Amino acid sequence: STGSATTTPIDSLDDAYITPVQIGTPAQTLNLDFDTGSSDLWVFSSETTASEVDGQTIYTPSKSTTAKLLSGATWSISYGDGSSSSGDVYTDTVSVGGLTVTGQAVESAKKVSSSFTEDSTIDGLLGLAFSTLNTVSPTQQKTFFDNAKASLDSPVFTADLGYHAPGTYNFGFIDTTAYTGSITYTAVSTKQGFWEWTSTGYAVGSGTFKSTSIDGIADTGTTLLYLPATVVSAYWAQVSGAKSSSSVGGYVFPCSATLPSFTFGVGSARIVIPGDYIDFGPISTGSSSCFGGIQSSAGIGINIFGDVALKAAFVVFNGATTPTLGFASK
């Protein structure tokens, strides 16, 4: 079997991507954030605290004839941005663009933090990192991909995010028309539960490529590209007026600038992120200072190849016996 669904940016800045997901019987369609950096499938629901719901589509487990409460199971998650959610667990039928999984753990939110409430376009998350990170207690649950894997035509899922445009999440197959050239595969470490790989280096604009090992994760759930301070300083040193701002919380640059591109290595291959992909608009409404899309990972603990980097490529999340990541230009 295979699945194919369109993913859409939530706003004009591509702050996150939403993909329609069918839950329960009859189908309850929720727009979820497909996150290769986490492993919980959680949704806004009829159980979420009323004041914490503001525009989101909710899942009502009582209206699903196939919903079953997982006895004594609870979940609680906290993300890198300081946001969090928690609640109880159901098992139900979940479908992504024609691909179905029965008995998928659907984590129903009783509480969500302010950032989830403030974003009415995101109805929940669909975790695509390794199941070892799933927070369901006392019995850990598997991801949608893990549950579907055996049934797929090929044990893979692909991410094809758009810049200011619609994109695609495919499951069980590789669309050979969605990229140019060849897919270069790279080694993956699953020891931290992430699609963690090593980039072979970088280049700023038309500058010389720097061979250096950058250990990071392929994360669709993170908006920006987080890299070592040395690398981010080299990039922003090419933009006149750019500076690191402690009040704004990162590198800012004059909105009138034309940003240079950023290249990252995948083995002998190169992925070029156009400069426009790194512009995250005014720091505050009406400001002439803009926020940068390439930020330092010094306070994180890990490098994050987020949406900024991934949307410049066709990305294969290969769940074969030994998982690997594939990257191609497009």
Closer to ligand U1Q by CB, 90 or 194: give it. 194
Smaller CB separation from ligand U1Q, 183 or 217: 217
Nearer to ligand U1Q, 127 or 326 (CB): 127
* Catalytically annotated residue among 38, 85, 108, 199: 199
- Alpha carbon of 267 to those of 215, 224, 323: distances in Å? 13, 22, 16
Given 33, 35, 40, 307, which residue is catalytic?
A: 35
Distance between CA atoms of residues 249 and 272, nearest Å: 26
292, β-bridge pairs: 279
Minimum CB separation of residue 180 from ligand U1Q in Å reads 29
8 A C-beta contact, residue 41 and residue 195: no
Write the Ramachandran bin of 14: left for phi over 0, alpha for psi from -120 to 50, otherwise beta.
left
35 as an active site residue: the answer is: yes
Give the tokens for residue 69: 């409460």
- Contact positions vs ligand U1Q (CB under 6 A): 35, 37-38, 79-81, 83, 125, 221-222
Residue with tokens 């445009």: 165
Q: How many CB atoms lie within 10 A of CB 86?
A: 17
Instruction: Please provide the DSSP assignment of 192-206 as one string.
Output: TSS-EEEEEEEEETT
The residues pairing with 137 across neighbouring beta strands, listed in sequence order, are 74
Tokens 């069918």 belong to which residue? 22
* Pairing status of strand 262-266 against strand 269-273: antiparallel
Residues 6+ apart with CB under 8 A from 330: 160, 178, 179, 180, 313, 314
The nearest distance, CB 322 to ligand U1Q, in angstroms, is 26
DSSP 51: G
What would the two tokens of residue 183 be? 């897919």
Residues 6+ apart with CB under 8 A from 237: none
With H, G, I as helix, E, B as strand and everything else as coil, classify residue 21: strand
- Which of 33/67 has CB closer to ligand U1Q? 33
Q: Indicate the residue among 283 and 304 with the shorter CB distance to ligand U1Q.
A: 304
Closer to ligand U1Q by Cβ: residue 199 or 222: 222
> How far apart are CB 308 and ligand U1Q at their closest, in Å?
13
- List the catalytic residues: 35, 199
